[PDB]
Amino acid sequence: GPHMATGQDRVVALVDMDCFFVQVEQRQNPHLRNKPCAVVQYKSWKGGGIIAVSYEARAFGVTRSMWADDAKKLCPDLLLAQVRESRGKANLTKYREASVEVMEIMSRFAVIERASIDEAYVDLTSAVQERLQKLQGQPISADLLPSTYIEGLPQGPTTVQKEGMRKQGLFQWLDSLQIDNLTSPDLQLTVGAVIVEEMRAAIERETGFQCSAGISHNKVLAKLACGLNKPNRQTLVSHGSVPQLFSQMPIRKIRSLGGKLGASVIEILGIEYMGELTQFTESQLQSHFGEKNGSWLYAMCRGIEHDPVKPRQLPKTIGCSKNFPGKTALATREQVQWWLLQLAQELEERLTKDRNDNDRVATQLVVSIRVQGDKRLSSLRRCCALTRYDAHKMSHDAFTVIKNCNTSGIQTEWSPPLTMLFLCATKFSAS
DNA sequence: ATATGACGCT
DNA sequence: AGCGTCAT
Numbered sequence: 001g002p003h004m005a006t007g008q009d010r011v012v013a014l015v016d017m018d019c020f021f022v023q024v025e026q027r028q029n030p031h032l033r034n035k036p037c038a039v040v041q042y043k044s045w046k047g048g049g050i051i052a053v054s055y056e057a058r059a060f061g062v063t064r065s066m067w068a069d070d071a072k073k074l075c076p077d078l079l080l081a082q083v084r085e086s087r088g089k090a091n092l093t094k095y096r097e098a099s100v101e102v103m104e105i106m107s108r109f110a111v112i113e114r115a116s117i118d119e120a121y122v123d124l125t126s127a128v129q130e131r132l133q134k135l136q137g138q139p140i141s142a143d144l145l146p147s148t149y150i151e152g153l154p155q156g157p158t159t160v161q162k163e164g165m166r167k168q169g170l171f172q173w174l175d176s177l178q179i180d181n182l183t184s185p186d187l188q189l190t191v192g193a194v195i196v197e198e199m200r201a202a203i204e205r206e207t208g209f210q211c212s213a214g215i216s217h218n219k220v221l222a223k224l225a226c227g228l229n230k231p232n233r234q235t236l237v238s239h240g241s242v243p244q245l246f247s248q249m250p251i252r253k254i255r256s257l258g259g260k261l262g263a264s265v266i267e268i269l270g271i272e273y274m275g276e277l278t279q280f281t282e283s284q285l286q287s288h289f290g291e292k293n294g295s296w297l298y299a300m301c302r303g304i305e306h307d308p309v310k311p312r313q314l315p316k317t318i319g320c321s322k323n324f325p326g327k328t329a330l331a332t333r334e335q336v337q338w339w340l341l342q343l344a345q346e347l348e349e350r351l352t353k354d355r356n357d358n359d360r361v362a363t364q365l366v367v368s369i370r371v372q373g374d375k376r377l378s379s380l381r382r383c384c385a386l387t388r389y390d391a392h393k394m395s396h397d398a399f400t401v402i403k404n405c406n407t408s409g410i411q412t413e414w415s416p417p418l419t420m421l422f423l424c425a426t427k428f429s430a431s
Numbered sequence: 432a433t434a435t436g437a438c439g440c441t
Numbered sequence: 442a443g444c445g446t447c448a449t
C-alpha cells in the first residue's frame with residue numbers, strides 16, 4: 001500500500017581500508033610497495049602468524065592466520081614486515097596512530113561510527129540533503145564518480161574489461177536518474193557516493209592509504225557493498241538491486257549472520273541464500289529465532305535495517321591481551337604476576353595517552369583469563385575499581401581478583417595453566 | 432598455535 | 442555481575 005516503508009530513509013556508507021596493516025608498513029618502507037607482502041607477529045614459531053596480506057600476495061593464496069613459513073611455500077618472493085614488540089607482546093600503536101589519521105579525515109565530512117581499527121560507518125543523510133540544495137538541479141557527471149560501481153548494472157544489451165563494465169553500469173545508472181526529484185532515494189545514494197569519492201580522495205591524498213567503500217541505505221547493505229569491489233573501489237547498492245543481489249547471496253555473508261545464528265537459520269530453514277528468507281512470515285521467523293532476531297531477519301532479507309550510525313569515534317574500552325597457547329601456558333605464580341604487570345604497563349601508557357587526548361578517565365578494570373582446555377575465548381572475567389593509572393597497582397589488583405582461580409596445592413605453581421590474560425579498562429567518565 | 436573490541440542475555 | 446556471540 002501507500003504505507004510501506006522501504007528502508008530508504010538514510011544514506012549510510014562503510015569505509016574499510018585495503019589490507020590496512022600492510023599499507024601502513026608499505027607507506028613507511030617503500031621497498032614493500034606494489035609487492036606481495038604480509039604483516040607478521042612473533043617470528044620465532046613457524047616464521048610468525050600472518051595478520052594482513054597485500055593483494056599481490058593474496059593472488060598466490062596467502063591468507064591471514066597462515067604461518068609465514070607456510071605462506072613462503074605458496075609465495076617464495078613474499079616480503080614480510082614484523083609487528084613491533086614491546087614488553088614481550090605485539091604492540092599495535094603504529095596502526096592505531098595510522099587509524100586515527102584516517103578517522104579524523106572522515107570526521108570532517110560527517111558523523112562516523114568507528115567500527116574497527118580500519119573501518120567506520122558514515123551517516124551521510126544530512127550532508128546529502130544539504131548538497132542537494134547547493135549543487136542545484138545540476139546533473140551528476142560520471143566524472144564525479146571515477147571509482148564507483150553500481151551493483152547490478154550494466155543490464156541488457158550494451159565490456160570484456162572490468163573498467164569497461166564499471167563505466168557502462170554507471171552510464172546506465174546516471175542516464176536513468178531523475179535529478180528533478182530531490183527525494184528519490186536513488187538520487188540520494190548517488191549524491192552520497194559523490195561525497196564518498198571526495199572523502200576517499202582526501203584520505204588517499206592526506207595519508208597515502210587506499211580504501212574501499214559501500215554506499216547504501218543501512219549499515220548491513222553498506223558493509224556488504226564495500227566488499228563487492230575491493231580494493232580501491234566503492235560500490236553503490238540501491239534498494240532496487242537487493243532482490244537480484246540477495247537471490248544468490250549466501251546467508252553467512254550478511255553482517256551478524258557469519259556465526260551460529262547464521263548457521264541455525266540455514267539448518268532450521270533449509271535454505272542457502274538470503275533471498276529465500278522472504279517466503280517466511282515474520283511470526284514464523286520469530287518463532288524460530290526470537291522476537292528480535294525474527295523481526296530483524298524479516299526486514300533484512302527485504303533490504304531493510306534500522307541500526308543507527310552511532311556517533312562514536314572513541315573506543316568504549318581499552319584493552320591489552322596476550323595468549324599463551326600450548327606448552328607456553330602460564331604455570332607458576334611468578335609468570336602470571338610478571339605478565340599481568342607487562343599488560344598493565346602497556347595499558348597505563350595507552351590510558352594516559354587517552355586521558356590527555358580525550359578528556360576522560362576509565363573507572364573499572366576488567367581482568368579476563370582463559371584456562372587450558374577451555375575452548376571459549378574467556379573462561380572467567382572479574383572486575384575491580386580503576387582508580388590510579390599505575391601499572392603496579394593495576395597489575396596487583398588484577399592478580400588479587402583472579403588469584404582464587406588457582407586450584408594448586410603448591411603455592412609457587414599455578415593450575416590449571418592460563419592460556420590467555422586480558423586486561424580491559426572500561427566505564428569511561430568525563431574528566 | 433586464532434590482539435582486541437561491541438554488544439546481548441540472564 | 443558474569444557469561445555468550447560476533448567481529449576485524
Ligand SMILES: Nc1ccn([C@H]2C[C@H](O)[C@@H](COP(=O)(O)NP(=O)(O)OP(=O)(O)O)O2)c(=O)n1
Nearest residue numbers: 016017018019020021022051052053117118449
Ligand atoms: N583477527 C584480526 C583481523 C584483522 N587485524 C588487523 C589487520 C588488518 O589489516 C586490519 C583490518 O582488518 P580487515 O579489514 O578485516 N582486512 P585488511 O584491511 O587487512 O584487508 P582488506 O580485506 O580489508 O582489504 O585489522 C588483526 O590484527 N587481527
Ligand SMILES: [Mg+2]
Nearest residue numbers: 016017018118
Ligand atoms: Mg580492511
Ligand SMILES: [Mg+2]
Nearest residue numbers: 016116118119
Ligand atoms: Mg576491516
